[PDB]
Write a protein that binds this ligand. Structure first.
Ligand SMILES: O=c1[nH]cc(NCc2ccccc2)c(=O)[nH]1
Length: 165
């Protein structure tokens, strides 16, 4: 069984009228939910406008994220994988001198739609420095990427991290 933390989606931007039941009926369309909670004030019971859903598998999380935008009880909500910032860009290190743009594209396009690939070169000599930046159109690509233990591109074991503004 995959760790529960990797099967969880934070759902922001809820309608205050959304309930455990209506959040569950929505997100059960994309998989089995082992948990589904709207967060509420402890005294007033008024919704705090966010909640969480937990799927049985990571593939179900993927299915739910691929079905965005989600409109729940009339409001477009904002799902994100649980932490284990929200950015669209990664640093990729360890690619040495023989990794080309197509190696990075062929691999990373399977995580999401790529907008920019920048293979870094030395400002003086033009030689490849062995790292690159990849910008995607959406943050879930990055969120999937950084929770993997390993990344192998063009036979190299790569170090990948979020890149920030
Ligand atoms: O030449 C470049 N340098 C840096 C880039 N990324 C942004 C960045 C910078 C520093 C720390 C984190 C992220 C880029 O795209 N191209």
């Amino acid at each position: 069984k995959e760790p529960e933390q990797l099967r969880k989606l934070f759902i922001g931007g809820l309608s205050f009228e959304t309930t455990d039941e209506s959040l569950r009926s929505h997100f059960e369309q994309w998989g089995t939910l082992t948990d589904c909670v709207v967060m509420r004030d402890p005294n007033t019971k008024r919704s705090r406008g966010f909640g969480f859903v937990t799927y049985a598998t990571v593939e179900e999380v993927d299915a739910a994220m691929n079905a965005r935008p989600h409109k729940v009880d009339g409001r477009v909500v904002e799902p994100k994988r649980a932490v284990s910032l929200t950015v669209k860009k990664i640093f990729v290190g360890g690619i040495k001198e023989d990794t080309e743009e197509h190696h990075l594209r062929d691999y990373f396009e399977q995580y999401g739609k790529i907008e920019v690939i920048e293979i870094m070169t030395d400002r003086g000599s033009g030689k490849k420095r062995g790292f690159a930046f990849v910008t995607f159109d959406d943050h879930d690509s990055v969120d999937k990427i950084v929770i993997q233990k390993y990344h192998t591109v063009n036979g190299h074991n790569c170090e990948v991290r979020k890149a920030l503004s």
